[PDB]
Symmetry: D2
Subunit: 116 residues, 4 copies
Amino acid sequence: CPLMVKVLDAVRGSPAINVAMHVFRKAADDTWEPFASGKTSESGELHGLTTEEEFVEGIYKVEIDTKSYWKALGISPFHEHAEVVFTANDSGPRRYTIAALLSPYSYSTTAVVTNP
Amino acid sequence: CPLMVKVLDAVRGSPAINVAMHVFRKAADDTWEPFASGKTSESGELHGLTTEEEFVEGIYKVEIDTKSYWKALGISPFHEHAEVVFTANDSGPRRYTIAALLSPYSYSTTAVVTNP
Amino acid sequence: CPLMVKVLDAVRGSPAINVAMHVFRKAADDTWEPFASGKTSESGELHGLTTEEEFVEGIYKVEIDTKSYWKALGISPFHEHAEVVFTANDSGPRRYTIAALLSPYSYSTTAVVTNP
Amino acid sequence: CPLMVKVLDAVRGSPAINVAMHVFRKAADDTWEPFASGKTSESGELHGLTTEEEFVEGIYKVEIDTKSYWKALGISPFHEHAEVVFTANDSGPRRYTIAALLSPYSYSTTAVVTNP
Ligand SMILES: O=C(c1cc(O)cc(F)c1)c1cc(O)c(O)c([N+](=O)[O-])c1
Ligand SMILES: O=C(c1cc(O)cc(F)c1)c1cc(O)c(O)c([N+](=O)[O-])c1
């Protein structure tokens, strides 16, 4: 698993379950092409988005659909989504964990990058 | 000032000065129209982006060039930029402050939405 | 104002108003001596805690009563309080702003340390 | 494992390894008694601090020695330590993950609380 995303709920102190997200890759013509998508599990984690062979050098965007998450809980949040944009595998393959901690009017995001 | 942006540096414990950003408004064809831009001041703040009459309801994106900020400090960053995508809502008067707290491999963002 | 505290509410997207806090200074016997206190204003800020001459180098603790804040909004919180423990340092002049961003099960805190 | 602590480094995008921390419990006379201590592993995690039988109702304090962590990396940080104070097991046994995301002048902390 070279790319894993973990989402936490700072209001309930729980994983953020069933959070949808889309991953895009910047194409040579500078547009965003669809790369992978999925939803977080009961642990707040989304695994298996890609493989080492498919996950080439590039600029990637993770768009986490935080608005739908909060709406289903009865909250009208500030953000449309949490957006994480980063260059990946510039110095060879790495393993990436992207984390997001969600509140209705705020979110934090961090990356843990490890060398296989 | 209906919309202000404040950027802070979590490594130096200081305003993040001379940080460039662009604000976009989502168009009917789901593309991002440039709307305003600028660079943070010595206080880390960017004022005067828009006016009350110009700032209508809609989806806005603030794209903060964090990568250039960290590269100018000689620190390798994770993100290409920090993105803040939100719906501006006109139920009551609203002044928006978008704040971002920057670290090389993480950022936090919050909205302080008040009434004069 | 050598020391100011600002508290924000990540659930409502607003200053955290009427938040009580106490500031302590570590004594020679490793106990916490009360030093100053107050409640945040309508802007979420607490000014006038100390003066330049009183605020000497040492270890300070800011104890923010986040639990009472959330209980007054009817929201069950995780933390008993938010603690910010830091060394005040006199190499150059220094103005300190302690900020805290509150969620029921999470908080962030940062220091913005500037020079007039 | 009813109590686990995870520490991340927001400057390097890595687990925070070999971070010491002490856990205290509030005694009936309102003083802090030592409860458990340890250091984070190569994954940034500290497991096995306590057991379900030992981890009774009470007010607990986790003091994470962030200052020693940053000093060893050549950074002079703002905080003496990160302090997490919370009531545990008030409604029966729970499993607690305490997380801390560290920067030199800022930290975030969150709790994930699950029912066994
Ligand atoms: O967003 C924040 C913020 C973000 C965090 O992750 C943690 C925290 F303690 C504050 C913020 C907002 C403001 O309006 C503001 O003035 C400041 N400040 O000056 O320090 C900060
Ligand atoms: O990024 C974080 C994170 C973000 C924050 O704003 C504050 C904080 F204390 C941790 C994180 C990453 C992980 O991999 C992870 O397991 C967890 N967790 O379990 O709680 C959290």
